[PDB]
């Protein structure tokens, strides 16, 4: 697998499969242009870690007959995760 690095606003580096990161149309544009690193000045590590779990969840469970479990979100991060999901279009 090609991996890409997604870097949070506080400098945490998340290394995820490229195919997983391409779940986000926004990330696809930042990697392709009109590099294998993307910096998110506005997404802290407690939010970007959850976005990466969402990518893993989505690729695992898309087109699956196996019963799908709930993607869990703590109340404390919901507002910031909503703003990140809105920017990332995922």
């Amino acid at each position: 697998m090609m991996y890409v690095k997604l870097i949070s606003s506080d400098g945490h580096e998340f290394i995820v499969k490229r195919e997983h990161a391409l779940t986000s149309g926004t990330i696809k544009a930042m990697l392709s242009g009109p590099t294998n690193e993307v910096n998110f000045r506005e997404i802290p590590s407690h939010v970007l870690s959850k976005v990466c779990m969402y990518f893993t969840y989505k690729v695992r469970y898309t087109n699956s007959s196996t019963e799908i479990p709930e993607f869990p979100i703590a109340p404390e991060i919901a507002l910031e995760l909503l703003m990140a999901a809105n920017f990332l279009d995922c």
Partner: peptide
């Protein structure tokens, strides 16, 4: 009857509406 894979955005809207 199963959950769909909601978009992360729709899933966040669900949790914020619940709170």
């Amino acid at each position: 009857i199963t959950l769909p894979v909601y978009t992360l955005k729709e899933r966040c809207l669900q949790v914020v509406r619940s709170l």
